[PDB]
Amino acid sequence: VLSPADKTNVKAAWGKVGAHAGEYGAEALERMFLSFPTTKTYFPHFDLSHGSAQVKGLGKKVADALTNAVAHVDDMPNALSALSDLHAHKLRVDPVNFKLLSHCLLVTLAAHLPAEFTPAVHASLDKFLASVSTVLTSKYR
């Protein structure tokens, strides 16, 4: 359950990220691939090397999904429904992996947001990404 303060904090952080969101999404993915190599197996058709257009493209989409969630934070199950279907039914993404990308998203924000990444905002962002992850893993059948 995201509190009013959590929603404030998350909106504030993503505001600062501003138009770098796409680039940061790509960076978080790269961090995940390097830190947690088991995650790479979902992307056999990707070149995952640094500067990859495919990782960049996906990073933009990931950022777009997260922004959609922020923008509709009280309706996240609905907002992310199609994405939850994709990740569970078609992609068969192990639920563990959401915690890995979530961590890498936090790290990326921390590396780019010196002023904003306070302990409180850190906590709010973690709750937000946990909420997103919960929706994205809600559709296994």
Partner 1 sequence: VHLTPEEKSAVTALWGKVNVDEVGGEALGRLLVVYPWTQRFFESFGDLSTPDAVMGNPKVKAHGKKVLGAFSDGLAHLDNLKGTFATLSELHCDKLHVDPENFRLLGNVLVCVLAHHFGKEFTPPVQAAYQKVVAGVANALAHKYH
Q: Which is nearer to ligand HEM, 12 or 86 (CB)?
A: 86
Q: Which is nearer to ligand HEM, 12 or 88 (CB)?
A: 88
Return the residue matching tokens 């973690």. 126
Per the document, the length of the chain is 141
> For a copy of itself, which residue of 7, 16, 60, 139 counts as binding (CB under 8 A)?
139
Q: Which is nearer to ligand HEM, 91 or 114 (CB)?
A: 91
Cα–Cα distance for residue pair 85/18, rounded to 1 Å: 28
The distance of closest approach from Cβ of residue 7 to a copy of itself in the complex, given in angstroms and rounded to an integer, is 14
Site for ligand HEM in 69-88 (CB under 6 A): 83, 86-87
Q: Which is nearer to a copy of itself, 60 or 103 (CB)?
A: 103
Site for partner 1 in 18-37 (CB under 8 A): 27, 30-31, 34-37
Q: Which stretch binds partner 1 (CB under 8 A): 16-24, 55-63, 68-76, 102-110?
A: 102-110
Taking CA atoms, 132 is separated from 47, 77, 105, 125, in Å, by 26, 8, 12, 10
62 binds ligand HEM (CB under 6 A): yes
What six digits make up the tokens of 119?
């302990």
The distance of closest approach from Cβ of residue 46 to ligand HEM in the complex, given in angstroms and rounded to an integer, is 7
Cα–Cα distance for residue pair 101/90, rounded to 1 Å: 19
Q: Could you give the residue ranges of the DSSP H alpha helices within the chain?
A: 4-17, 21-35, 53-71, 76-79, 81-85, 96-112, 119-136
Site for partner 1 in 120-139 (CB under 8 A): 120, 122-123, 126
Integer-rounded Cα Rg, in Å, for the chain is 14
